[PDB]
Amino acid sequence: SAEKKKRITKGSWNVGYNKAMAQNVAAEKVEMYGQAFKRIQDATGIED
Amino acid sequence: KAYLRWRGLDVQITDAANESKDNVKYLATLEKSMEPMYQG
Amino acid sequence: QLERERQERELQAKLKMEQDSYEMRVAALAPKVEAMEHSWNRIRTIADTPEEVLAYWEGLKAKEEQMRSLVSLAEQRESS
Structure with a gap:
């Protein structure tokens, strides 16, 4: 328990x-x- | 008795879901230039 | 007989001590549960500290590479 x-x-x-880490981790996906x-x-526009 | 199994499955499901979203979104970016080669 | 009664009282006192200790540990159990829940949530969201640092560094590198790539693509589009 103690360990x-x-x-x-x-x-x-x-x-x-924790609030900052949680927000940063969540954002790191959209970013x-x-x-x-x-x-x-x-890419597609250049190809077109 | 089953709650150890449920937290284990929760960790597995979150990790699998996150990697699945990234993998699917990146493999979907490939699609618009892989599409010509199926029938052309 | 009085000595035996005193010994019994001492044993009861030792029990009481091994009960108070249990009690304090039980109260610390709530803190342990909160810490375990926080650790599990952090691990699921992401040894653990190294993984989080690696993820942050990878995200930063990916963002940089992305900006450079976007710039390259824009330059190529302008040239075309």
Whole structure:
């Protein structure tokens, strides 16, 4: 019990703020999918 | 008794879902230039 | 007999101690459960710290490469 608590606390300490980390991780998907869609569009337009 | 199995399946399902979304979205980008070669 | 009664009382006191300790551990159980839930959620969203750092670095590199690629494609489109 205590060892698991210490491990969890250490992991949380290493990471950044939970709210910030959660938002950053969630965003990191849109911040990439958008870019990808834009690249695919530009590609198709150039080919056309 | 079954809640260990359900949290394990939850972790597996979230990881599989995330990798599936990325894989599907990237393999879908390929489609508009792979489409000509099926019948042309 | 009085000594035996005292020994029984001492055993009861030891039990009480091994009960109070259990109680405090049980109260710490709620904190343990909260920590476990947070760790599980963080792992699912993403050893764990290294994976999160790698994911962040990969995302940043991908964004940079994406911007460079988009610029290349725009230049190619303009030339065409």
